[PDB]
């Protein structure tokens, strides 16, 4: 995947144009760059599976991988190692950086890729096989559960629709809260970027069912939560 980073592309081009001329037989340059480019290209060849690899990374992981690669590569070119020894360690370095990259990607997968344990999260990602950056839909569950809230009289009712992943998700709109009546209808109470609804100084009549609906440009909610509120005199 690291070849999707411009710094790496640049380092390979300097390696071919600047470094090889004085550090390798001319009759070798064409065949050598073929092999190098193929070995970098091969950073994308990780065993496809969830919690390990799905053909994508986010930008941070690409950067981390790119940084590690470039530092290792520079250590070689800074040293002016020539000929047969240069080739051996270039490729052994590549082989070792690929495993180091896999290490970063596996962490990405386990921790960063579709973090949401519910709802639908929009996440920007880079596709390792084509270097295209696009937004992906992480669909976990149709709704994100129910809540039971106890709220004494004269006390403030607070319904929190925030979820740890909301901040990071992309293309979020406005939390919308609804009051859900015994009929088959509901009424809107508030919409806005307030991730919480508050009704001050609750009375017995405020008890009932509410519901938050965090909107998305996808035009299908990112988060649906149902609150069951009881007022306990």
């Amino acid at each position: 995947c690291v070849i999707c980073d411009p710094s790496v592309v640049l380092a390979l081009k300097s390696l071919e144009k600047d470094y090889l001329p004085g550090h390798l037989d001319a009759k070798h340059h064409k065949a050598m760059m073929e092999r190098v480019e193929n070995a970098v290209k091969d950073f994308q060849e990780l065993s496809l599976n969830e919690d390990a690899y799905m053909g994508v990374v986010d930008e941070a992981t690409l950067q981390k991988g790119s940084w590690s690669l470039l530092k290792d590569l520079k250590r070689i070119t800074d040293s002016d190692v020539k000929g047969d020894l240069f080739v051996k360690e270039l490729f052994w370095m590549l082989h070792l950086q690929k495993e180091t990259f896999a290490t970063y990607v596996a962490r990405f997968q386990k921790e960063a890729y579709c973090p949401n344990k519910c709802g639908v999260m929009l996440q920007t990602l880079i596709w390792c096989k084509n270097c295209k950056k696009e937004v992906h839909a992480c669909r976990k569950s149709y709704d994100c559960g129910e809540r039971n809230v106890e709220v004494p009289q004269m006390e403030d009712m607070i319904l929190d629709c925030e979820l740890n992943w909301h901040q990071a998700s992309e293309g979020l709109t406005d939390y919308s809260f609804y009051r859900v009546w015994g009929n088959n209808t509901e009424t809107l109470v508030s919409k806005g970027k307030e991730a919480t609804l508050t009704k001050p100084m609750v009375g017995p009549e405020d008890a009932g069912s509410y519901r938050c609906e965090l909107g998305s440009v996808n035009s299908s909610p990112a988060t649906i939560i149902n609150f069951h509120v009881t007022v306990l005199p």
Binding site: L48, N49, Y53, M54, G55, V56, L125, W127, C128, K129, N130, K132, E134, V135, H136, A137, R139, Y142, N218, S219, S220
Partner: protein, 209 residues
């Protein structure tokens, strides 16, 4: 009217008969007014790996979003459309007069051309998805000697993609949209469902027993 109109296939998750559905999820919304799919089913049609089928679209990794979208629509169309009547057949090679599927549902050019264009730079490893997959780790994975390459490589034309992904549930019709002789797998709801008239035409057009 006609016995091949407004029916659902005797299949897995399909409803007995089509009926409206207040809330249908995302891509499967155009069939809201009259649908052989349920809500649950329409959600499940949007999943990473869908519980509706044993199949993984992400065998070479994630499809690009705009490619994935076409596959979810094909699935919506397949699970929700009450206009497939004329192409409903028994499962297995054999005639009616002797468990159901659909066979050769004619998709318009544009539906297949758009699908192919948006899937151009997504990745797969097989030019025919019905067959030699490896299932040794639960879901289907790419065979030993089969490189992940662009859809434009394994599915050289739009017809190949329409046909070879889903066992000829679909055929890539030479006809274009608003010919009255092919179905769209998706349509903007604002305008009407253009497939109603197409089913009507084939139900009474196919000289059959």
């Amino acid at each position: 009217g006609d016995e091949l109109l407004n029916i659902c296939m005797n299949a897995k998750h399909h409803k007995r008969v089509p009926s409206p559905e207040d809330k249908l999820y995302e891509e499967c919304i155009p069939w809201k007014d009259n649908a052989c799919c349920t809500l649950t089913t329409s959600w499940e049609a949007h999943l990473d790996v869908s519980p509706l089928y044993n199949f993984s679209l992400f065998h070479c990794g994630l499809l690009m979003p705009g490619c994935r979208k076409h596959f979810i629509q094909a699935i919506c169309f397949y699970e929700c459309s009450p206009n497939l009547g004329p192409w409903i057949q028994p499962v297995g090679s054999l005639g009616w007069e002797v468990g159901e599927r659909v066979v050769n549902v004619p998709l318009c050019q544009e539906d297949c051309e758009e699908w192919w264009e948006d899937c151009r730079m997504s990745y797969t490893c097989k030019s025919n998805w019905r067959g030699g997959w490896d299932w040794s780790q639960g879901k289907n994975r790419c065979p030993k000697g089969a490189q992940c390459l662009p859809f434009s490589h394994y599915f050289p034309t739009p017809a190949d993609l329409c046909e070879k992904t889903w066992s000829n549930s679909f055929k890539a019709s030479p006809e274009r949209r608003n010919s009255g002789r092919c179905l769209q797998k998706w349509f903007e709801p604002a305008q009407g469902n253009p497939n109603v008239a197409v089913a009507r035409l084939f139900a009474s057009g196919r000289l059959v027993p």
